[model samples]
Target chain A: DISPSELKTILHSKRANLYYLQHCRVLVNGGRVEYVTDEGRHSHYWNIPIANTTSLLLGTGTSITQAAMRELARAGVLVGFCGGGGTPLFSANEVDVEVSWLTPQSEYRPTEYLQRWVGFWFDEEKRLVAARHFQRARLERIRHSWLEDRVLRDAGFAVDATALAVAVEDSARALEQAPNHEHLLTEEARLSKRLFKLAAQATRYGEFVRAKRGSGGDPANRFLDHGNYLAYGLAATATWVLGIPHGLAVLHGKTRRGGLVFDVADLIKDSLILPQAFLSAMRGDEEQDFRQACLDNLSRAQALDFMIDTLKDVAQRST
Target chain B: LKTILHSKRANLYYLQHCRVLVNGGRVEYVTDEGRHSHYWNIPIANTTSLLLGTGTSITQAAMRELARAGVLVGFCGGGGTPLFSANEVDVEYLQRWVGFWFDEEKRLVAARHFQRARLERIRHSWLEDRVLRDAGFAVDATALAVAVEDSARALEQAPNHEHLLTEEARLSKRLFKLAAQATRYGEFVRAKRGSGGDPANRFLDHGNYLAYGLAATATWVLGIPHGLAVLHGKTRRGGLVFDVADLIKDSLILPQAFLSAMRGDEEQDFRQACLDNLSRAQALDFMIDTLKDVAQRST
Candidate 1:
């Protein structure tokens, strides 16, 4: 064990980001946190001390390291993942009893939830595809009827409808971005590609979230009543920045319930946490493995990153 | 009739307010107040605005609309009026409203800090005025004998209780009380006196608007979280919203407009002129456009 002075000196090390020790709190200037041990339970408590914490990095899979995690109530921390997932409290049964609570705040990297959120809409899109398929099947069945059977068959509405659906998808995509980016399309088109990319990121993030079970850290669940509570709270912290609003919004469009901040959070959810954490879980060998993979991937650092980055933008826009 | 209809779009469209009720997004003729007031029917998604009236109610609605749209509502009301409404527009609620537009936490914190400071400054100034008035100082008096005596015996008279009456705190209470009084008076003058008396117009004075607007705009642009206010306590309209409407007239009509009206102007006529200026196409148009534009923008 190092002496208090040694700890203090280490905290002040140039290699250290920035450290300050006061009020029983040990703060690092800019250190990555490796959330080792039973941390998932106490994720919300995973805060940078009020002194001078530059960056917090937590290693993946550090949460399952607890012996009596089950015996504990809520983990004294807030935990979640990037890419279609968010802060969650893990159960003791999910964690191994052999593990211990110990960690070095130096093994994580900040994350934007996903490369983008295009992944979130996967589930909704799948549902749309299924619904359209069912509708087409119904249309075909209707075409088999006695009303000018041959001439009815000649009716090209099915084709037109299919085309219209595709166009609708295209238009929706267009609306997500600003304007054309197709060949010979103006700069508006080119810029829209990025916007579409951002929207696609939103959809993809949504898809990734929808694919998850109704368990901890589901992105879709982030929109659930419970998920929004934190969004409401933390988003307010974000709005404290400036120019943020809870009613009129670009992302997470207006909702009747008046959680525009949640909507904004929804808009940026993809880059906040998807493909990286939740999507990978969906790729697991089995459902059980998927859930376990998700639990392992989400850590304290990632959750904080999402809160800080996503919220800061909204907050700054508010005042 | 035909020529009149051709000349006026209103005559051609047969325009009159219509209250279309939707049982389920389907149009129905429903009387909301048991009065068939709405008559003209236009099918468009209508954005809600405040209900205009003669008094405090009008200001209240205006205040609400401004705050909702992310505009700054500054204040130059009574001293005791809490700078913030606690339960009405709590810090947590404002934080949520603000976060929708902003994403940075540090910036939000600073914005909140600045708003708190702004209110504190207003309270301090108000308290100084009150202190002077309390000590027999008058607007016309060069120097009151009591004030001079108080100044000389300042140290001797200083006491612990007097500390409680510090300028800022005292002014805070005074401001609160004054704002309530002004609001009530304006409402009474408008409602009971009539539009010709123009009670609403008094509340809409350029000076008051500028004073409030300046503080509100400064705090808002500085990125302070207005809703999560600490000092003024909570009132529904107490959040960042209190500053929104106040900020609308801060720039163009400040000091200049006020000074123009103050110099060689009668109180009644001056009030009328102020109202007329606000009602003029340029002023009203600018206000409408500015307000609508801000509201339409995404946070």
Candidate 2:
């Protein structure tokens, strides 16, 4: 049994893992995790200290007992459900630890202080400023990826980085001048579509259009979706782990369950996902290579830290 | 191994009558936005829990972010009812000591530690009395000091568990009576009804509750089983809370509370003063650390 003193040191270290468990039954015995197989076989499972694991990614075949879940919940771990191919479906966080101390005289709770949230939700001026921030960032990244791939492809269709930089500056100005949130989004969509088309032309691969779902859709989008899965999965994990609300979006529309996930995925798409997707399309075997490239790009961008820092910026009002 | 986001501050915040909102990554409080009458910006990263007293309101938006940051929200009342509480209780590393309470030797050892600590606290109060009298306060503490010495010797010679309990009870009675007499500062009134429900004993009762709250926080964080107590048994749900609170009350909380009330401090002021002292002294951390020490020693 792990002594309470040792547990104290382990907690101080704050080490966590993204556990991907499938087709298993999990339980707790003497402060260690126990896994049992269906065939009546007991494998000496390597003890994964429950305290160190930050979140558990439960895949389709996973079965966790209520006792195990209660044990995990007490540890403050985030548990996310993922569909086949590691696409995040939803997540459940451990109940927040309660303050045992009571303020007998205090009349207000923390939730009552959200006047600014409602204020910003209705304020068009604030919405425009936020929309511009997201749009400008996405445009600049798409532009950069297109320019980076320009030299790596055919010379005749080579794109100029300097010209793209100037165009991005102009795009930034357009976003700033956008009169409303819809207008800003429409302008951003037009600019990004053209930029992706130019990028495809440069690569001489599949033609560039917006993403469409399912197998019958554009093959390029399939690759983009695969890349998006990795990005969004990471975003989902961070969102769950950090305690950020999923639908309370600042950039994207709030109707979808994964609105905030989409918003975070977009932030990295142009710079991280798009370039890799286009490169994979140029190659004959797109799927395997695209998935691998996305993983590589995620690490290169230090995706989790970027997402956390960016979300912190968006969540925090400067005033 | 991976890096995890840990709560940055060790402090629990107590807020009253404020509207809590998520202003970015921080918890913001405002009574009204237009007048700027009341507002506070607290960093969400470090706060362990937000204790909300009556009349306090919070937005769901703020609650969502605070929940994300692993901060606990507790609703408390003036009459000492903890109405509702929500927290991210991470009990990952805690081991369920199967049959811990059922073990005869372990219980006896734990009981010994409990009695010893209680007696030591009695000794501490008398020692403090000696200091107060020596400072020329017109009070004599020589008899209290001798009593503490005799109890310490008896505790040292305690041969069995039952004997330890008897000695502890006897020493506790003497210590409280002496401490109360010493606090009167020359008055002739005997300490009345120290148990509970006395309208005149309000200050001490409130003080005891505060100590329990501190002990509860420590117990929850440490993942200690409240039902499996050392000196206390299956009598109360918070058996260990009472046990831990008892260890601190005689030496730390009660004397100060009783003295403050005697000095004409009002209820609210006295409560605030006691809570402030607890916070400043890092009372929660001390309780947890001391519990760990006692557990280790007993083991």
Q: List runs of model 1 lying over 4 Å from the truth.
A: A1-224, A256-259, A267-319, B1-140, B143-299
> Which ranges of candidate 2 are over 4 A from the true structure?
A1-319, B1-11, B24-26, B33-47, B77-84, B96-101, B115-141, B159-161, B185-202, B264-270, B295-299
State each candidate's clash count: 141, 38
**Candidate 2: tens digits of C-alpha lDDT, residues A243-291:** 4434435566533343556676677776667666666776654576666
Where does model 1 sit among the CAPRI classes?
Answer: incorrect
How much of the true contact map at the interface does candidate 1 reproduce, as a fraction?
Answer: 0.00
**Model 2, range B1-299, lDDT digits (tens) per residue?**
32334333335566665566546656676664332243454446534666555445554445545655656655444322222333324321123322234465676676666666665664554365343334222223587667767877786687765676677667766755565566663322324546543322667677777777667665555545444566654434456777777776666565555566456777787677666555544556556666776656543
- Measured by lDDT, the strongest candidate is 2
